[PDB]
Amino acid sequence: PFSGLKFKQNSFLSTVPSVTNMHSMHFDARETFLGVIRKALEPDTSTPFPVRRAFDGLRAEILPNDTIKSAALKAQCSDIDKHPELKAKMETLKEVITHHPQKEKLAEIALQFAREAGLTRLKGETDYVLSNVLDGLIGDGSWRAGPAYESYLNKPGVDRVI
Amino acid sequence: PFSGLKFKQNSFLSTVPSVTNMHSMHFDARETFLGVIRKALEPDTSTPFPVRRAFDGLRAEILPNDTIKSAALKAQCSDIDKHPELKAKMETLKEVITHHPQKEKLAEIALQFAREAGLTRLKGETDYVLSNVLDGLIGDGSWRAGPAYESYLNKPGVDRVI
Amino acid sequence: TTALVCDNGSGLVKAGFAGDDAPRAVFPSIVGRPRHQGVMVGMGQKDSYVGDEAQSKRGILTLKYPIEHGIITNWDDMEKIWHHTFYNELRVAPEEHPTLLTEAPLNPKANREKMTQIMFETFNVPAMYVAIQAVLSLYASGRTTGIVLDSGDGVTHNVPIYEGYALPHAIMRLDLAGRDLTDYLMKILTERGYSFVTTAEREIVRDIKEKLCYVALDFENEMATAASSSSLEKSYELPDGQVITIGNERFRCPETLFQPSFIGMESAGIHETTYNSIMKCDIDIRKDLYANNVMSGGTTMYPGIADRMQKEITALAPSTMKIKIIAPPERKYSVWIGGSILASLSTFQQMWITKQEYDEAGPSIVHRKCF
Amino acid sequence: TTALVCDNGSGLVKAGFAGDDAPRAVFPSIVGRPRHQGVMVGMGQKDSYVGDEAQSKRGILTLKYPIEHGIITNWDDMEKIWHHTFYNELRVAPEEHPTLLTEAPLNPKANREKMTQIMFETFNVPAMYVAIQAVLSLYASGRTTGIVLDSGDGVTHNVPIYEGYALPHAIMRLDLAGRDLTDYLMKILTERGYSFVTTAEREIVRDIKEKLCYVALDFENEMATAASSSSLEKSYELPDGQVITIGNERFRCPETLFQPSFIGMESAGIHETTYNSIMKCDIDIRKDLYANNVMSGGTTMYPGIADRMQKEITALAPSTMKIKIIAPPERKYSVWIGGSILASLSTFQQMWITKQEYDEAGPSIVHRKCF
Amino acid sequence: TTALVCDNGSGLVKAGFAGDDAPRAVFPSIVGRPRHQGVMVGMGQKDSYVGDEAQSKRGILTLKYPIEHGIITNWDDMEKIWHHTFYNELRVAPEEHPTLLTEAPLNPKANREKMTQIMFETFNVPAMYVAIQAVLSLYASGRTTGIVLDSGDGVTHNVPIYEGYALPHAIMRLDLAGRDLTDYLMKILTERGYSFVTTAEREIVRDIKEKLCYVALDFENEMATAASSSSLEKSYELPDGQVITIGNERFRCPETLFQPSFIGMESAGIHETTYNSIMKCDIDIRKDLYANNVMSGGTTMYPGIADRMQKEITALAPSTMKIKIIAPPERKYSVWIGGSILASLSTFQQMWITKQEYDEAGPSIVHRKCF
Ligand SMILES: Nc1ncnc2c1ncn2[C@@H]1O[C@H](COP(=O)(O)OP(=O)(O)O)[C@@H](O)[C@H]1O
Ligand SMILES: Nc1ncnc2c1ncn2[C@@H]1O[C@H](COP(=O)(O)OP(=O)(O)O)[C@@H](O)[C@H]1O
Ligand SMILES: Nc1ncnc2c1ncn2[C@@H]1O[C@H](COP(=O)(O)OP(=O)(O)O)[C@@H](O)[C@H]1O
Ligand SMILES: [Mg+2]
Ligand SMILES: [Mg+2]
Ligand SMILES: [Mg+2]
């Protein structure tokens, strides 16, 4: 449905923050991961116009720029059944990011935001956008468990070593 | 005469040995104190060239690197009156180290080599290099007496205490 | 009622009202994300600094530019900087005053189409207009003819223009500019050991460049002065306190404008692409272009740049007739000031792009407004 | 309702409620078993004294510390001391109030993982939080920037931090601290014959140290004052009655902070690992770190320590710009007081580690809470 | 008659004769002063050990490197190590054989000027020549084109070069290298409690690093293997006898090459500054640079480093065309072996720097010999 549309390569490398940045306690990882997905889905100008402004027109009510619009976006994410026409337009974007040409480089960085920044600390209770965008990049959706484990205690030998 | 010449800060901190090192009986404190003064007077590369290789050219016949050259250097220090042209070029370097920008940090460490390593155990009979380089860093030259005293015996009270 | 004029500078966003002599606020076009822990609890907010507050706080930020080579790349950040212009530093409602964006010639169409689409559908300005950089600069001259060496932070370009009429085929444009100066100055400081690596140091390289670097009148004979290095070197205090000094690298960096092979780009220098532009122009105008050369843009604030190109174009011109280099003392703001004039003309209020004619036109309306 | 803050001191456990100015109870972190016959029949109970009652009864005990070098070693005794905090001296139910443990940076992970596992599965506190030592101390400063010479009893460390944002790669840490001072003071009392051998005497060495030892402004020139030993010596009454006196050993012991080769560890002194930390920091912050140096921790209560490092960092800094040493008169309690502030902030009650989120997380939850 | 080639390694001095396949002697670039009493009377001599004898005797020495970041700092010690090469281990008279020093690109000029002045006016070699590191490594390839990821102990750098002709503006260089790996490995051993502090332990950290650390193919998915920590851990016997073990810290240390934010330096990884170098190169060469990527230097002996960057540059390249990573099994000695070839060419004996042309030239002669 959005055929004839493409993106420029490596469009998001300036946007992904440092690892010491995302180890912050005042780091609301939602609006900076979406801000990566916003920049990563910036359509290349080689796409023709009538498919460009439609796909951009789908974006502004899905991935807004202002911090009050995305905070307003989460408001209907609690009752996504009662908002079908925006909920139905979301899986279109999920279909687009499924065929994204740098999907693996996204999917490598997408769950790098999940562990180091704690993006997926709800694990099944995250809202509708962070659910399917990760499910757009991670096919099996196996991100539910796995970042929580960190191999806490094991001492196969001697005590403190000096 | 050596105007427009400068050094980098803290250039000698790697060179000054530990205190337990300089409490050695096989620690000939001359060639390791000169080796500090050699490194501490390393000219910074921001100095221009024709003042750089002249001041470096004064050094190689004053502060050599090999242990046989400095041992040869002490040989004319016994008859420094009969070698005027090198004796006259020494006070030029004494003038340089007088205006050294880290003189106090040198002069703090310069007599730290004097006590802990026993550099000044001749006290008036040291040769010409260790004389004026210390006199370059210590202005009044009051290093003759003072490191020898250590406050041997005083018992203002009771005997052994268990 | 009044109009705003806001030169989208490639390095420094210059902005202000129409009819004002000086631009109201000039701030560097820098957006910056922080890059560290933030273990404080209160000061961890404001996750993207932009402008002067990113300039002062530059030690903990990854300073990135939204515009490179005159082409607006990161449109997400470019909203953030324009929101900082209107609300945060001009304190004006954008929905009430008309704006006037400016841009380089020969940039991509989508740099223009998106720029108007992000102006109406985001800021809802009443009317906008996009101007070529150098054709604003003749309004700053108060003179209607002559080519312009408009060298900015991101791109340099020549727009030859006779009285009224421009020469569109003879517009030449080189991407060598102040960032390519700054990046080459970073390369040649490493020869003296002053290794300045990351973007915070890339900022202070420009402070070295704008305070020290002059361009030489005769490059080889003044290089030979640096052989007998006696009085060439100055010395610059870094923000930490330790001081540098710099010798032949002080003038060898702005020779990139004249020998672009120093940064290895295969081109003619800006003295020669000047003459290559005037040779492209028709033969009657060439007498008047030689008498009218307007230096413009902040890169051309190098001392000696007027005395150099007056010498060097004379080497290329036929020597029987005179050359002039019109270098005013306001070259840094010349694009804005001419932009401040053009919005104030009474014959211009029909030349805008209004919203009521935008809505049936779409973003291609700016291609039928001065190309 | 209220929170408890209990700094796990390496030498002195400091504890109290949130929002209180002074910590409620400060007692030395000493557990001690007796070591003799006990031929009395009634007083033979209480086979492990801890805290002040181990301090007063120190003559018949083997006084051992549970924490060395900031690393909690004996976890069996470390339960015993925390049980003494909550029940025996604070008299509060730990299951009702949230706690806030504090620890050094760059300690092992199991020092943190076991510490939370022994907090929930033993004391059943509602919510806990682990803080880096020195980042609490800026809250005691009421100032959001500057490095901290936080020298405790067990470890010293520098946490450089700009406004909000810390520098995790530039955190430096040396194990030289007050016990390494005390052990070196025991070595140099033997030069005057005052042989203090075992742990009861190791306690009274610290009473010699905290009452007498000052650090010299200029080490060599004030050593030369001890050559003409006229007014340097003071004299200290031991608990038995016989009196000692001490000369050059009074100031030569705290020079271990500046010459770590005295105890033979190959390192830079705390004046130099200060400067080595600021050189690791980025170049813009260095101007502000030099104006903001917070002495903290009980080791830095030596008289003259501020006048020394202000002199000595000036020797290492570029002299064109100023240095400051912020040494408040509450440096002994600065980690607690800043800890008392941080728990009292209204923006902090979402930053805890609750039990209901612990149970699906396990002890690795603290690694995703401020590292 | 024959020439010597002696790669001034930042970590390991590699040396040998011209035309030899293997370098004659490889010893670590360590000079070391002792740091203790020496109450023996006979063995107190030789007050500065250097090389392998400093390596074996490393427990009583302060091991310091003369070269950091590819820049020769301590010129007094750098004489001592070169005197150890020629006399002590090669046993050749330096006045008879020509030498060939090697160095990194973009190092300071005084690192080159002093290096030739300390070569003639101290060792009196007949003729010398200074070569860029990576351009020697193509001679080891036997192939005349392709960029080189030459990552040494002290610096990594990319020298893109087409057949014959190099790209001087596209030479990129990062200071992240094996010491920055070793220093970060020391930081992350403390998370498991293995506190290795001083320079003798900094040596044995490198023995941990070179024997154990591999780089991961996919960092996050193989980090998740360390969550179910079953088969990742190996275990290493220290020289005293007590054994360590190491889990996720084994592969997390060489990820500093790819995420330089781990040591907090703001840069692109060596996978990305590869691609940033090739984007700087002209558009025809880019097809051939992608087919020709030479890993070189001892840092790139990590297992899996070829399989990683072949994956990761493929993520950055346009996927329509192939990538190759030429990782020979002699990458540790590739700079020497290509240096051994270049001195043996019959077309090279006019390319030296002879003493008879030095004497009227001075130390600036090397700036007119291959820059
Ligand atoms: N007074 C000055 N002296 C030297 N260089 C200057 C001076 N002012 C500005 N520059 C250089 O010019 C550049 C500013 O370019 P500018 O004209 O602002 O670009 P734009 O036209 O895209 O806004 C900066 O990189 C700066 O280094
Ligand atoms: N007033 C003082 N004068 C000198 N030394 C002191 C003073 N107060 C404490 N100390 C030393 O400081 C140490 C206490 O440090 P402390 O604040 O307990 O560190 P921590 O709280 O991290 O354990 C003790 O070893 C003591 O020797
Ligand atoms: N087999 C190996 N496995 C892993 N790392 C190695 C190996 N061999 C060497 N290294 C690393 O490479 C460094 C040697 O690099 P070197 O050849 O000295 O570079 P340069 O000669 O340019 O200084 C050592 O410090 C070590 O850390
Ligand atoms: Mg400008
Ligand atoms: Mg404490
Ligand atoms: Mg190498």
Q: Which domains does chain D have, with CATH numbers?
A: 1-27+69-134+334-367 (3.30.420.40), 28-68 (2.30.36.70), 135-181+271-333 (3.30.420.40), 182-270 (3.90.640.10)
Strand, coil or helix: D25: strand
* CB neighbours of residue E46 within 10 Å: 11
Considering only CA atoms, give the Rg of chain C: 21
What are C294's strand-pairing partners? C148, C326
Nearest CA residue ID for atom 4, ligand 3: E210
Strands C101-103, C4-7: parallel, antiparallel or unpaired by DSSP?
parallel
Distances (CA, A) of C131 to C78, C99, C338, C370: 18, 11, 11, 8
Quote the crossing angle between the two packed helices B128-137 and B67-77, to the nearest 10°: 90
CA of E11 to the centre of ligand 6 (A): 8
Rounded Cα–Cα distance for residues C18 and C352 (Å): 14
| Cα C190 to the center of its chain, rounded Å | 26
Q: Give Cβ neighbours of residue D355 (< 8 Å, ≥ 6 apart).
A: D120, D124, D125, D126, D127
Number of helices and strands in chain E (H, E)? 13, 18
Quote the crossing angle between the two packed helices A29-40 and A103-110, to the nearest 10°: 170
Choose the closest CB to E199 out of D110, D261, D266: D266
| Cα E77 to the center of its chain, rounded Å | 19
End-to-end CA distance of chain E: 27
Rounded Cα–Cα distance for residues A115 and E80 (Å): 50
Calculate how close chain E gets to C195, using CA atoms only, in Å: 9
Decide if B48 touches C, using CB distance below 8 A: yes
Rounded Cα–Cα distance for residues D255 and D223 (Å): 11
Strands C71-72, C67-68: parallel, antiparallel or unpaired by DSSP?
antiparallel
Instruction: Residue C242: list chain B partners with CB under 8 A.
Output: 9
Q: Residue D10: is it exposed, middle or buried by C-beta count within 10 angstroms (0-12/13-18/19+)?
A: buried
For chain C, the residues whose C-beta falls within 8 A of a C-beta of chain A are 33-39, 41, 44-45, 47, 62, 64, 74-76, 79, 108-110, 117, 363
Residue D136 token pair = 């609490």
Distances (CA, A) of B158 to A88, B108, D193, E184, E278: 95, 37, 12, 55, 82
* CB neighbours of residue E200 within 10 Å: 18
Instruction: Report the atom number in ligand 2 closest to the C-alpha of D297.
Output: 17
Rounded Cα–Cα distance for residues C346 and B114 (Å): 87
Per-residue buried b or exposed e for E274-293, using 16+ beta carbons within 10 Å of the residue's own CB: bbebbebbeeebbeebbebb
Contact B131, D219 (CB under 8 A): no
Distances (CA, A) of D324 to C316, D138, D313: 60, 15, 10
Q: Give Cβ neighbours of residue D240 (< 8 Å, ≥ 6 apart).
A: none
What single-letter amino acid sits at E12? L
CA of A160 to the centre of ligand 5 (A): 21
Helix locations, B111-161, DSSP H: 112-116, 128-137
Give just the sign of the alpha carbon dihedral B56, B61, B65, B70: negative
Q: How many CA atoms lie within 13 A of D248 on its CB side?
A: 16
Instruction: Report the atom number in ligand 2 closest to the C-alpha of D335.
Output: 21
Nearest CA residue ID for atom 5, ligand 1: C210
Contact E254, E213 (CB under 8 A): yes
Residues with CB under 6 A from ligand 1: C 9-12, 152-154, 178, 206, 209-210, 297-299, 301-302, 332
Contact yes or no for D168 and A152 at CB 8 A: no
Strands C353-354, C156-158: parallel, antiparallel or unpaired by DSSP?
unpaired
Calculate how close chain B gets to D126, using CA atoms only, in Å: 51
Nearest to A115 by CA among E264, E248, E253, E223: E223
Instruction: Report the atom number in ligand 1 closest to the C-alpha of C154.
Output: 22
Choose the closest CB to A152 out of D73, D363, D370: D363
Which phi and psi (to 5°) does residue D306 adopt?
-80, -40
Residue D106 token pair = 């760059």
Nearest to D135 by CA among D177, D105, D170, D111: D105
Q: How many CA atoms lie within 13 A of C254 on its CB side?
A: 26
Q: Give Cβ neighbours of residue C331 (< 8 Å, ≥ 6 apart).
A: C295, C296, C297, C298, C300, C301
Contact E133, E156 (CB under 8 A): no
CA of C155 to the centre of ligand 2 (A): 62
∠ Cα C165 C170 C175 (to 5°): 120
Q: How many residues does chain E have?
A: 371
* CB contact residues (below 8 A), chain A span 76-105, against chain E: 101-102, 104-105
CA of D152 to the centre of ligand 5 (A): 6
- Which residue out of C186, C196, C197 would a mutagenesis test of the E interface target, given it has the greatest number of E Cβ atoms within 10 Å? C197
Q: Which chains touch C (3 or more CB pairs under 8 A)?
A: A, B, D, E
The secondary structure of residue D228, as a DSSP letter, is T
Nearest to E70 by CA among E177, E227, E201: E177
Choose the closest CB to B20 out of D244, D261, D272: D261
Contact yes or no for B157 and D243 at CB 8 A: yes
Q: Give Cβ neighbours of residue C31 (< 8 Å, ≥ 6 apart).
A: C48, C49, C50, C54, C63, C64, C65, C66, C74, C77, C80, C81
Choose the closest CB to E318 out of A9, A146, A156: A9
Nearest to C233 by CA among C219, C221, C215, C248: C248
Calculate how close chain E gets to C263, using CA atoms only, in Å: 6
Rounded Cα–Cα distance for residues C261 and E297 (Å): 31
Choose the closest CB to D348 out of C37, C38, C41: C41
Rounded Cα–Cα distance for residues A129 and C195 (Å): 45
Calculate how close chain E gets to D256, using CA atoms only, in Å: 16
Nearest to E342 by CA among E135, E33, E145: E135
Rounded Cα–Cα distance for residues B56 and D103 (Å): 52
Contact C230, C224 (CB under 8 A): no
Choose one of E7, E8, E10, E13 to mutate for the ligand 3 pocket test, by most ligand atoms within 8 angstroms of C-beta.
E10
Which phi and psi (to 5°) does residue D132 adopt?
-65, 145
**What was the resolution (in A) of this experimentally determined structure?**
3.6
∠ Cα B34 B39 B42 (to 5°): 125
Quote the crossing angle between the two packed helices B84-98 and B49-59, to the nearest 10°: 120
What single-letter amino acid sits at A89? K
The DSSP annotation for chain A comes to ---S--B-TTTTTTTSPPHHHHS-SS--HHHHHHHHHHHHTPBPTTS-HHHHHHHHHHHTTTS-SSHHHHHHHHHHHTTGGG-HHHHHHHHHHHHHHHT-TTHHHHHHHHTHHHHHS-TTSSSSS--HHHHHHHHHHSSS-TTSSSSS--------S-S---
Which phi and psi (to 5°) does residue D289 adopt?
-70, -35
| Residue spans of beta strands (DSSP E) within D262-337 | 293-296
Contact C28, C66 (CB under 8 A): no
The DSSP annotation for B6-21 comes to -B-TTTTTTTSPPHHH
Rounded Cα–Cα distance for residues B51 and B5 (Å): 7
Calculate how close chain A gets to D365, using CA atoms only, in Å: 8
Decide if A14 touches C, using CB distance below 8 A: yes
Choose the closest CB to E267 out of C190, C195, C198: C198
Strand, coil or helix: B155: coil
Strands D4-7, D101-103: parallel, antiparallel or unpaired by DSSP?
parallel
Decide if E244 touches D, using CB distance below 8 A: no
Rounded Cα–Cα distance for residues C355 and D35 (Å): 93
Residue C56 token pair = 């002062």
Distances (CA, A) of C230 to B57, C185, C209, C234, E189: 20, 22, 21, 11, 53
Residue C287 token pair = 């007498």
Contact D155, D304 (CB under 8 A): no
Residue C317 token pair = 């011109």
Nearest to E35 by CA among E55, E56, E58: E58
Give just the sign of the alpha carbon dihedral D35, D36, D41, D43: negative
Decide if C227 touches E, using CB distance below 8 A: no
Q: How many residues does chain D have?
A: 371
Contact yes or no for B48 and C192 at CB 8 A: no
Rounded Cα–Cα distance for residues D253 and D184 (Å): 7
Strand, coil or helix: E38: coil
Nearest CA residue ID for atom 9, ligand 3: E298
Q: Which residue has the tokens 């899905």?
A: A62
| Residue spans of beta strands (DSSP E) within B4-156 | none
* CB neighbours of residue D207 within 10 Å: 12
Contact E219, E258 (CB under 8 A): yes
Distances (CA, A) of C21 to C140, C330, C341: 10, 11, 9
Rounded Cα–Cα distance for residues D333 and D133 (Å): 11
What single-letter amino acid sits at D263? I
Which phi and psi (to 5°) does residue B76 adopt?
-85, -5
What single-letter amino acid sits at E44? G
Per-residue buried b or exposed e for E61-87, using 16+ beta carbons within 10 Å of the residue's own CB: bbbbbbbbbbbbbbbbbbbbbbbbbbe
Distances (CA, A) of A158 to A161, C109, C304, D66, D159: 8, 69, 73, 19, 31
Q: Give Cβ neighbours of residue D56 (< 8 Å, ≥ 6 apart).
A: none
Rounded Cα–Cα distance for residues C116 and C103 (Å): 12
Decide if C240 touches D, using CB distance below 8 A: yes
| Cα E132 to the center of its chain, rounded Å | 12
Calculate how close chain A gets to D351, using CA atoms only, in Å: 8
Contact yes or no for A45 and C33 at CB 8 A: no
End-to-end CA distance of chain C: 27
Rounded Cα–Cα distance for residues E188 and A49 (Å): 52
Contact yes or no for D368 and A152 at CB 8 A: no
Per-residue buried b or exposed e for A129-153, using 16+ beta carbons within 10 Å of the residue's own CB: bbbbbbebbbeeeebeebbbebbbe
3-state secondary structure labels for all residues of D46-72: CCCEECHHHHHCHHHEEEECCEECCEE
Q: Tell me, using a 6 A CB cutoff, whether residue E9 lines ligand 3.
A: yes
Contact C334, C296 (CB under 8 A): yes
